[PDB]
Ligand binder design. Sequence first.
Ligand SMILES: [Ca+2]
Ligand SMILES: [Ca+2]
Lengths: 297, 297
Amino acid sequence: SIKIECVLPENCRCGESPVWEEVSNSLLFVDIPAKKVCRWDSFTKQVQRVTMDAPVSSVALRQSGGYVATIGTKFCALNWKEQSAVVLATVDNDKKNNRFNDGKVDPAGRYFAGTMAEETAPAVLERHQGALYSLFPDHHVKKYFDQVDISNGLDWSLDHKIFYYIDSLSYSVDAFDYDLQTGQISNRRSVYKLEKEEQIPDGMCIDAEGKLWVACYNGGRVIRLDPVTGKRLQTVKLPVDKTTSCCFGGKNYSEMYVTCARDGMDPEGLLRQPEAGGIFKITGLGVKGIAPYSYAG
Amino acid sequence: SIKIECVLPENCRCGESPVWEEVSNSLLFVDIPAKKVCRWDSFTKQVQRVTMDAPVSSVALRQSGGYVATIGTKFCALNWKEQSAVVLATVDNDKKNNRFNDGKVDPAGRYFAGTMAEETAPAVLERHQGALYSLFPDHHVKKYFDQVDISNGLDWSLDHKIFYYIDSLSYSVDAFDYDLQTGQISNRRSVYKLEKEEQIPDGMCIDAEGKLWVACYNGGRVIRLDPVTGKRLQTVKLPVDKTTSCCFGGKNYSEMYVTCARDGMDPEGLLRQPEAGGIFKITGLGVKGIAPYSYAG
Ligand SMILES: [Ca+2]
Ligand SMILES: [Ca+2]
């Protein structure tokens, strides 16, 4: 009764950062090395595309209007209709081949995003070169920690007391105590270690029951995790191997949207997986998610 | 089957640089932060140790008599007999806290050794402060490259046309084309990426079939690698996690000796592995190694 369909065969090089915009019933997402932000209207089925001058690794809603995005190593505000971005802040000013990777807005409107060294591939990048940052509403940037290999999926518990975080090459989903008032995190611990067949943990979202959904890059699946009991609750396999991230959207957040990547596939894979890089929608899971937060600056 | 024996429960802070001295049937090794160069007589089972005035990170045979060693950031001649060091050359004169790490003599009698920033935890240190050097027979020094994190295992193919090399924080074994006659290296490429469970690649030696054995720090193992296919051929697990290096020794190089470290172990861990820091001997691998080369200067 679980239905998986490709709703948009966008053939992304590396589709990422799905975000649901409930005021327009649209899905935003990026295609990182194509430098591309996309917005798909789920009612008209139309997609709009904008291309930036550097890799675009995440996008988020901005409450005052437009969007925010991580472009290269810069936090930026985007005016969609003017096709214009303004730089809010720049990070990793000493590295000279880094980029932002995954990012998401916290329950107080702060845009968290982490970095990584750029890659010729998974493990193939300079190691431990990233850091986790957050852009506060007053446009100050906080640096939380470094030594990150690949900053990836992240989300917050429903009572806004825990921050969940993936550094991919740790193969671990971690938790921190989190203070909603100051944005401060502490007491890092692992909540879940992936199995071999689950491959590399990539993007992540929480659901309305407090469970975590993690996209498994090269594992062709999302997994549902109980961060309190530490147990995997479910596996949902997709028709593509390079599953990168996931969010809930649609009617009452009852649908899951999954991004994936076409880069790195050989001909043979591409036959077999002709919708690689598409946007997939999973219905019938019997769980709902929650709305995303919007940047407050 | 293989057989593993702790032949010397030496409890080294950080045992390293194992070298077999067949002319005395002894294993040479260092304990880096204890500042000691050690000889273990495999017949009487007794150990000699000489204390230097700075961390001693590698030792090698010197054809003309005695040993050469890397002490702090100095290449030194060691008169065993007087327990005196003569500086042959120094490197990293500009650095706030570097030391040599692993070193080994090449097939023409040149002393290769590289550096790193000193640690404050494993493996945690100022990034990219090291370089790979070689000490030539007339005591001049060649600098091959910098931006090294932790210079660390190395060896040469049996046809003397390839040099293999680990910078630990690359989690990779690299190969270079190597010219016996000039000591020059070129065309760097990775030949093997460690898997997550293999942790940090540390020391490395070649066997008589041209395959590489790599000690996996915190992985409690040595792995056998095929540098031509990139395939891992074998895993041998040890009773301790902090395996640091390995060499062949014993009669016709038919036994493997493995060093390890006690530093950074929890009281806990020690308790689970009381021989941490010991010297282990592995028999039954079914392949032999080759003799160490001797410094020609
Ligand atoms: Ca990702
Ligand atoms: Ca070492």
